[PDB]
Amino acid sequence: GAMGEAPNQALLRILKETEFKKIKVLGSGAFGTVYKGLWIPEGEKVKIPVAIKELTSPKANKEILDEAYVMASVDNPHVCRLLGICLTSTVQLITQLMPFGCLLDYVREHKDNIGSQYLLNWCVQIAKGMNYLEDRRLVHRDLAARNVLVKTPQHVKITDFGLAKLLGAEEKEYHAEGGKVPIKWMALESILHRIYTHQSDVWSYGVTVWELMTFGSKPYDGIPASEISSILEKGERLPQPPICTIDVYMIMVKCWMIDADSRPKFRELIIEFSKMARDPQRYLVIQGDERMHLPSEDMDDVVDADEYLIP
């Protein structure tokens, strides 16, 4: 026979609603609402900065729970950590607060301060996260700059596991059936046959990097989603970002090969960008890159989730 499955002994923590203090809304629209607050577990003198997602039909609940399932099953420095859920009117996901929001907005808001060093290391960090995810045998299916959070300019993590799927021990791919999926970030295979693999996540990684290298530009801006499949088949791809050397662009391009197994592996990606991070200005030619720097309820018993390690 072939390889089997091991038990998933992840713990799903259920939190007391009277332990939060929704300090202020962080954002809402097409996903429900995301507030900002503190989690203050009875007893222990600890105040944890958190994000509360209060996304009331059965479909919504069944979906936000599928998400918590994934988040509760992964543990890595570059993957957003789930603190637990709250079972009230509608299920609330509680996660570590990322003070600077999603990377897409962050680079758009600080175009004039993103140096090559930060960019390349973000690339390394995202690759480490995804590489980890591949070990767990999990296909994210929605990697994009908007789904990468910023704890600090020096530390980012992958988030939004609402489309993630966990493959079997020797399963090579996931066959989706239907529904809205972000076309401009998906691999040709995914668009044409609804096939998802770690390698199609690699294609999404290429687009994420591009977004970052273009300081937040929109992929195929203006081009209708329905035309994307054509363009790709014809061989066209996203343009070489102005600050990129052929070295970096080459990595992106390999991520967009028609042949999935030809694209690079996250482990290789981590290696490539690490090397480049050792001599940043040699791979990204950014104006004023020499002088670009990025910054960093009651501060007392406040502890970041990364230092509150409950079993």
């Binding site: 999926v181 972000p182 076309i183 970030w185 998906m186 995914s190 989603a225």
Partner: peptide
Amino acid sequence: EIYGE
């Protein structure tokens, strides 16, 4: 943010 296939 790009949808549908």
